[PDB]
Amino acid sequence: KKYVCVRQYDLTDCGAACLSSIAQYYGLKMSLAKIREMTGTDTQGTNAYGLIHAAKQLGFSAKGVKASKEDLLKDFRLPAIANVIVDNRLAHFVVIYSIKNRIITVADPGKGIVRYSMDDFCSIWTGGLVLLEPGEAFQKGDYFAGFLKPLKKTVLCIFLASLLYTALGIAGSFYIKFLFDDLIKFEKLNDLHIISAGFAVIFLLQIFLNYYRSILVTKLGMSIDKSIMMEYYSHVLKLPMNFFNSRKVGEIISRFMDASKIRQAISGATLTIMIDTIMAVIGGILLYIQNSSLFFISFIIILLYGIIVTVFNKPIQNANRQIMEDNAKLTSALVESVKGIETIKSFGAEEQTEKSTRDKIETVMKSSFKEGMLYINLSSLTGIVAGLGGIVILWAGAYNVIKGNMSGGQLLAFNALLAYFLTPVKNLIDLQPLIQTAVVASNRLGEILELATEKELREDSDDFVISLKGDIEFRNVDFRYGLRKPVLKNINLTIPKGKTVAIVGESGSGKTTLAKLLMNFYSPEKGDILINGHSIKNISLELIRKKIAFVSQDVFIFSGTVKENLCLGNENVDMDEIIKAAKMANAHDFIEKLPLKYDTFLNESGANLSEGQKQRLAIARALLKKPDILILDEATSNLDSITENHIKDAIYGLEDDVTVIIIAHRLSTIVNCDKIYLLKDGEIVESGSHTELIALKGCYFKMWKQTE
Amino acid sequence: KKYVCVRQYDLTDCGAACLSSIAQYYGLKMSLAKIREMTGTDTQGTNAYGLIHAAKQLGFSAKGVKASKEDLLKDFRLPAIANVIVDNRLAHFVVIYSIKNRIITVADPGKGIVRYSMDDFCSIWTGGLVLLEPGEAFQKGDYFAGFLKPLKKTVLCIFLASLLYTALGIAGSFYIKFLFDDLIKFEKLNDLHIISAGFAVIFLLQIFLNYYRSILVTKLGMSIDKSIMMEYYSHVLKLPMNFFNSRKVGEIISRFMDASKIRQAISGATLTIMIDTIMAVIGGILLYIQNSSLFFISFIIILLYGIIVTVFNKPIQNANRQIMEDNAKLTSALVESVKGIETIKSFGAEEQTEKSTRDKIETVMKSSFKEGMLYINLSSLTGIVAGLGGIVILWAGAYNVIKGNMSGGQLLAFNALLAYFLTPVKNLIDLQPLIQTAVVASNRLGEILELATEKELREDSDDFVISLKGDIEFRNVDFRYGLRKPVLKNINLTIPKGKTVAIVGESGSGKTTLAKLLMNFYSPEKGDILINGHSIKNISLELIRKKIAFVSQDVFIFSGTVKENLCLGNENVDMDEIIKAAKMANAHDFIEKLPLKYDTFLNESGANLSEGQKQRLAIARALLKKPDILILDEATSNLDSITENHIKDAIYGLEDDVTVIIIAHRLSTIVNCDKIYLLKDGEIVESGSHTELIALKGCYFKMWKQTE
Ligand SMILES: Nc1ncnc2c1ncn2[C@@H]1O[C@H](COP(=O)(O)OP(=O)(O)OP(=O)(O)O)[C@@H](O)[C@H]1O
Ligand SMILES: Nc1ncnc2c1ncn2[C@@H]1O[C@H](COP(=O)(O)OP(=O)(O)OP(=O)(O)O)[C@@H](O)[C@H]1O
């Protein structure tokens, strides 16, 4: 056996890095990004419970107990993961491989191979330990193309064009060398004119080849950009709301906009690499035929250039990864700053926002200064190396001329061959900047492959039939958001079928998350939500959100025409149906006074529309969808009595086919209804009808008396 | 005089273009951007009333009457602007300059100048005319540096470095030519080694000079980008919310990010232009000394290159302006699509939101393909011209060698001089892409140069006297948003001083714009808003927003820590005051249960906070500001019973120093208050106290009876 460890790449989430390191220690050479993302890493630091769950799903026999002071154990099972409080800063996760008698081997990825004595061990940490051992499910073993395959003919044509251009250049160089070698002391004017005409024809042929080469390179880049953009965006929509809550808007906006670099750079780099490969293949044979000493000198120069580029390849990513993830932060701050235009001016804090944006610009630009300084230094070093190589080549040519080995035509041919070889040097210089494509590909694939499980695989629906009607119910449902005490602690609730039930409660008493669970926005940990003797986990997710709607309080009016916003979702809608819906939800008398009936272009999100009017419009839009089960969180008319219509028409229009769940902020708005459900401290405290709850004389009656 | 006209650049709003054209016809060389902006151009088209208002404010004596069929008028005052219904498509605006007997000269911006008689003149249009004449308020006359001035030493150093590099190159070329001319067949090994060492030393000096020059340009571009970005953001801050309502968020975000190139290309192009100027200055003298025929050939080649680059110089902007304006629209739609992630998934319409994005990508990429095809074509013709010039130069050199005019060393010197001259050709090729910076500079001066700057221009207060606070009142206030009937028609309202007054109404009855006017968000057209015998137009705008707050219903929680959000605006706040405020607005018992007291990092806008809880937090934040005049819009805790506290503590805590305006959606929540103000159809319909209004038995009583 030998010592092996994996170092740190991220900054805040070192626990996932430690888990990956122990994974490859047991022999799982899997990408750390995907494993880290399905571990469930937190920005502020996931606790040991998430790590235990990640070990369980990986196939480990993990168990978490406070760290034993006696770290000289014998029946112990290595390696181990433990917590440390580094000089009273935070809790960091470290791994220990093999104790012998006295040496504590800690493989901290932060700063390399670490070696503390027990004096430091007793000083740093306080308590924490997870005993991870494989459960034989965690099994050992030494465990893009489609886009290239759709343009095989174009790739072949581009390669043929590059080969033709290289052949034309080689033929022209050979003809020029032969003319110089033979027709030197010729003194012929017509021959010179004919040679000039031939050279002009060769140049015209080269231009003709360059036409097709450049046009097809641009066309290939176009299609590659289209494919990658479309795939990313399609995958970026199909995510659960948890990823949206976790990340900012700008950290998503900036990732998509970075394709402009990769498309152009890859389009250029493919042609450059093909041309360089062809040129090197020709040049190697040409040099081998020509001479050995000149070939040796050229090989030495190429080896020096390759040594330089290999030595300085690593540092480029170290700057690019900072540039990208600081530009992302700049965009994320600026988007939010612009969006809250009303609030920023309302409290008159413009200069503070300006100074914050100045700080963001200053850091994003100080990073760029270094990222350009490295490029300039490398370019200058490469140019100096090229100049030294050219001086050496000139000296060698002079020595050969003095010795009489090579002739003037041979010197010209050697110069042409050296230029052809240095074309690969220019290709290597360009590929030095291909790290700019590598970093953007790795950054954006970081949520393409890792989050792929969240797209549809995590659903695991597998459902035989469709739709629902009846009654909803809960069974031992425990739901938590993470880093917080559970809000849905223990619910035993069965809503009566086809009745107007309502849920009242207090602020922070989970009045919404209860409805959020029904839409399968977040999956519950324990228990299940049953509908007509079924389960949410065993029903198609499309019908789950298609048959039941949800009128969120923060209504989001989508940009475009009114007809599109009303028709969003269920497409192919006749105008008569939406007219009936608007009359049903009081959205027809409103639309009459607008300048263009159902043809007004709404800018941004209801900018030219009143907030109460937008709330009414959202209810109308939901009533278009014809939901069987409806959920209204207050936000009904928001105009005092008028709200009588926008519900009474529904209940009268229901004809007992639908059921309604009213998350009612304002008590006494729900009096003549089937049941009232209070949940406090997670548990369903008291339930019953209005008269029954009033006669009960509990906390419900106390709150009612306090209200009035 | 002579005929002059202006061509159309936009598509939908040609009236602003016609107004600008008639402005230059009367001697106004102002950018059409600002004029088009304060004309009030709509996506569909502004009527004649807005154009008349624009003429009045610009200083043109305009009057709008239906067009006279008898268009042979003699007492008339040309030029004229008239509307036309072009073959029953839309209402376009045209200008007529001079009529002789049977001549109509339509200088249509869309299709240039056309000549028509009355044969078609009566056929096309139906009715409309505006008679614009200079009222002598308009006047005739032929109506960046700081950033360059702060880097004079750096610019001088860069110029000196470029001159040193040019001198080193010239000295090396001259030494090489002299060595070839003198030591052609000397065959001295020591002399060759010494010459190689000297050439290597010269190359090292040139490499050092290029290194220093490159780092100079990099740091100069750094500072230029910093200054320009910082300037733009501040100017994008104090702009009327009108600008925010009119424009999308992406059309603002894409402008700021556009600097990424302008900075880099300008930094490169400054050094390139300086080097090219120095090289051309040297080369002209060198060629004049050398020979005339070679100088004539070089001048002809340079003229051909200039002609070919100038012929296609204008078309590049015609593509870049499309590229930028389409990328802006892509970002504007995609940002909204991402930020409405809840609503998109609520109705499960991810399919449509992908197809629309695919269409946007397709158009923004076809435009890019065209704009790259133009670049490739121009580059290919430039390369072909360069190759032809090189062939001609080789033929001329061969002819001179045959005639015996120039020698081999002279041929090498001529080749070096030709390379130095063609360096300016490469500089011109690079400056061909400087249109990419010119277009973004123009697009962004379309905002920087052309903006309202609400602080500087719209205010015009210049208040030296201390602000006075008391009862508020309205005087003949008429306020409209544009293209709509006025919402604030005619108000004669005087709020009692230091009393709890409330304003109730119906949806679409200006239930907020009335308060929006007080904050001087939009300036009223007629009348004024008086405070303690003063006016809003004659009070400092900072105090107007510092002394009175506004709790918007769409609360915007600003990203960061809770302490920052509470302390936003009024900085330097002691913790005791915010604790008192939170206890005053019920925001302390909330903050206790959170994991970190006043130190929780909020993602996005209240993502990990309850909606209602964020609403309460906004009220607490407003109560920090200690406003003398307060405006609530329901949205007080929204928990019914608890709301009693979050107002009663304020009124008890006010001690009559403050006054409160309650825009109350829910009637019967305001019973024990000073006055109730109903505004209907713009006018104040009925006012009075609760008992007085009940005894009045009007529409107020009818609505009360209908409510319950
Ligand atoms: N991502 C999250 N989503 C929802 N609630 C969260 C989240 N993170 C933390 N929480 C907390 O969990 C609780 C759930 O609040 P919930 O959204 O259910 O309230 P609500 O229905 O808006 O309350 P109210 O009675 O004021 O109307 C709150 O205390 C909230 O601050
Ligand atoms: N920029 C704008 N600001 C406000 N209203 C606008 C604007 N543009 C158009 N409108 C329209 O003008 C009318 C004025 O509405 P206003 O904003 O005064 O109502 P509100 O007080 O917000 O409404 P409510 O009390 O019913 O919720 C509405 O029909 C609104 O849609």
Residue numbers in the entry:
A (entry chain B), B (entry chain A): 8 to 150, 158 to 722
Task: Quote what the paper states about this structure.
To obtain a structural basis for this biochemical property, wtPCAT1 was vitrified in the presence of excess substrate and ATP. Mg2+ ion was omitted to prevent ATP hydrolysis. Cryo-EM reconstruction resulted in a predominant conformation at an overall resolution of 4.5 Å. Density modification further improved the map, showing side chain densities for the dimerized NBDs as well as ligand densities that are consistent with ATP. In the presence of ATP without Mg2+, wtPCAT1 adopts an outward-facing (OF) conformation in which the NBDs form a closed dimer, and the translocation pathway opens to the extracellular space. The intracellular, lateral opening of the translocation pathway observed in the IF conformations is completely closed. The PEP domains are flexibly attached to the core transporter, with no defined interactions with the TMDs or the NBDs. No density corresponding to the substrate is observed, possibly due to the limited resolution of the PEP domains. In the absence of Mg2+, PCAT1 predominately exhibits an OF conformation, in which the PEP domains are detached from the translocation pathway, the NBDs are dimerized with two ATP molecules poised for hydrolysis, and the cargo substrate has been released. Using Eq. 2, we conclude that the energy of the OF conformation is lower than that of the IF conformation.
Peptidase-containing ABC transporters (PCATs) in gram-positive bacteria function both as maturation proteases and exporters for biofilm formation, quorum sensing, or antimicrobial polypeptides. Substrates of PCATs are synthesized as precursors with an N-terminal leader peptide. Proteolytic cleavage of the leader peptide at the conserved double-glycine motif is necessary for secretion of the cargo peptide. In this work, we determined the structures of wild-type PCAT1 (wtPCAT1) in the presence of substrate and ATP with or without Mg2+.
